[PDB]
Each structure stands twice: as structure tokens, then as C-alpha cells.
Paper text:
A well-studied [name] was selected for rational design as it has efficient [name] hydration activity and could be heterologously expressed in Escherichia coli. Thus, to better understand the key factors controlling halophilicity in enzymes and to develop a halotolerant biocatalyst for hypersaline conditions, we undertook rational enzyme design by selecting just one of several mechanisms present in halophilic enzymes: increasing the incidence of acidic residues on the enzyme surface. Herein, we describe for the first time the successful redesign of a mesohalophile enzyme to an extremely halotolerant orthologue, that is, one that is active at 3 M NaCl and above, by altering 18 surface residues. In contrast to suggestions that large differences in accessible solvent area, non-polar surface area or absence of large hydrophobic amino acids are the important features that allow halophilic enzymes to function optimally in high-salt environments, we have found that increasing the number and distribution of surface acidic groups alone is sufficient to impart this characteristic.
The conversion from mesohalophile to extreme halotolerant enzyme is conducted in stages to assess the effects of substitutions on overall protein stability and degree of halotolerance. Crystal structures of WT and engineered enzymes were obtained to confirm the presence of changed residues, that active site residue positioning was unaffected and also to compare the overall structural similarity of the designed proteins with that of WT. The structures of the four engineered enzymes superposed almost perfectly with the WT enzyme (maximum root mean square deviation (RMSD)=0.42 Å for M4) with no significant differences apparent in their secondary structures. Some of the orientations of other surface residues of M1–M4 were also altered compared with the WT, although none, with the exception of N62D, were in the vicinity of the active site. Up to 18 amino acid substitutions were made to the enzyme surface of bCAII, but this did not significantly alter the secondary structure, catalytic activity or stability of the designed enzymes, compared with WT, in the presence of added salts.
Residue numbers in the entry: 4 to 260
């Protein structure tokens, strides 16, 4: 099974998942000098009021907060998108110290962590089916920048003791994912992929320009998770970020510019 270790990490993924060297891999560095304006782009529309969070799960690579996606209760529209996209889950990536951990980077600048809010195109019947299509998924990426303690985030971090090891899950109702958004939805967008195996090239990326905050003390909580299952030898979730991949023949577009 793949991981982030020296012997199963990002550098090795291409063996079991050759699409790792595909034409549209994520994440990427966003060079702000090379970002294009596009009048076809629209403001991002997030409709999360009716969202109902189900549970929080440790899957051995990160942790996920799952949402009810059986109806249009938490949907993403416009931005670069056509149609309706349902929120299925969010999860995080982070690094071993505060100076690194984001997957996307801006002019090479790394944030301490990154939040990925994962959505699927209701044109397909479900998440799994959508993931197999180039227009199937839309992921909103949000940077976590070290500074002030974040009370919204803290609610998530308060649950982590319950899911320390791989396979553990806990009830996590009434979490508003809109509480993990910044107050400006300016974005960069490009066509890409999942940043974890199977690295499917089915994601329209929407990376928010403006980060949310996280304290250094809060960041300590992320790294107390275990990659390993209960009973197995301890391996701390110190880092789980894929590095920047080549942009190749893609163009990053910016809204409002
Ligand atoms: Zn992710």
C-alpha cells in the first residue's frame, strides 16, 4: 500500500499508479506572474447552509470529515464550473514543521497546511462514478497560514483524540464547512487530479487566494495522528503532502483576475 514514507512516498507512486506522470497532475506551483484573466470565469458560489456532517474518519493517509451527499444540501456552483457539485468530504494535508505542508504553493511559498473540500458533479450518479471523468470532481483548496488560533478549526481538532489510529471513526454532527472558508473567495483555477493515489485526472482545481489561520499550537495536534492501525507499530502522521508537480501544457486562470 502507498504512503508518504521514504519507501512508499510520492516519489514511488508512479510504479503502482503510472498516471502520476500524467499530463494534468496535482498539486502545482501557482506562479502569479503567469496567471491569466478570463472573462468567462464567474464568482464562486458556495451553498453550504443545509450541510449535514456525518462523521470523522482516519483512513491511514489523512483524516476526512464526511458529509451527506444524497441531495443538494451542500453544493458548489459557478466559479469555473458548469452544473452543480455536491460536497462529499473535506480533508487536510500538512507537514512536519510550520514552514511546510501545503500541496499547492504560490510563487514557491509554502503554507503550514491545506484544506481540500471535495465535490462531485451531479451529472454523474455518485462520487465514484464522477471521479472517473475529467469533468467529475471539483476541489476547493484553502491554505492554512500560521498565526491566530482558529476556533472553527479547533472543533475539528478537538475530535482527533477519538480517531488517533487508522480505521477509527467518530460521530461529528453539525459542522458547517463554510466556517473553514476565508471571507474573500477570489481563486485560481486549473485542470488537475487527486493528490493521492489513484491520482485520477478528473479534478477542476479551485485554490482560494486568501488563507485561513491556524496557530502553531493547533498545528501540533495534526502531527499527533497515527498512520498506523491500533496494535501496529507507531508511525506519526508528521507529513502527508505531495510536492508540486509540473504544470506542463496547462494555464492557471485567476478570478477576479
Ligand atoms: Zn487532498
Amino acid at each position: 500500500h502507498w504512503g508518504y514514507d521514504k519507501h512508499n512516498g510520492p516519489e514511488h507512486w508512479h510504479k503502482d499508479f503510472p498516471i502520476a506522470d500524467g499530463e494534468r497532475q496535482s498539486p502545482v506551483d501557482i506562479d502569479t506572474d503567469a496567471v491569466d484573466q478570463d472573462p468567462a470565469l464567474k464568482p464562486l458560489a458556495l451553498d453550504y447552509g443545509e450541510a449535514t456532517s456525518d462523521r470523522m474518519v482516519n483512513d491511514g493517509h489523512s483524516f476526512n470529515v464526511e458529509y451527506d451527499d444524497s441531495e443538494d444540501k451542500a453544493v458548489l456552483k459557478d466559479g469555473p464550473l458548469t452544473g452543480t457539485y455536491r460536497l462529499v468530504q473535506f480533508h487536510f494535508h500538512w507537514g512536519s514543521s510550520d514552514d511546510q505542508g501545503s500541496e499547492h504553493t504560490v510563487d514557491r511559498k509554502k503554507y503550514a497546511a491545506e484544506l481540500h473540500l471535495v465535490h462531485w458533479n451531479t451529472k454523474y450518479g455518485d462520487f465514484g462514478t464522477a471521479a472517473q471523468e475529467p469533468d467529475g470532481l471539483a476541489v476547493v483548496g484553502v491554505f492554512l497560514k500560521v498565526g491566530d488560533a482558529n476556533p472553527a478549526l479547533q472543533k475539528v481538532l478537538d475530535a482527533l483524540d477519538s480517531i488517533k489510529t487508522e480505521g477509527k471513526s467518530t460521530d461529528f454532527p453539525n459542522f458547517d464547512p463554510g466556517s473553514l472558508l476565508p471571507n474573500v473567495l477570489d481563486y485560481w483555477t486549473y485542470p488537475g487530479s487527486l493528490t493521492t493515489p489513484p491520482l485520477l485526472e478528473s479534478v477542476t482545481w479551485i485554490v482560494l487566494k486568501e488563507p485561513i489561520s491556524v496557530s502553531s499550537q493547533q498545528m501540533l495536534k495534526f502531527r499527533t495522528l497515527n498512520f498506523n492501525a491500533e496494535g501496529e507499530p507507531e508511525e506519526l502522521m508528521l507529513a502527508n503532502w505531495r510536492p508540486a508537480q509540473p504544470l506542463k501544457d496547462r494555464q492557471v486562470r485567476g478570478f477576479p483576475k
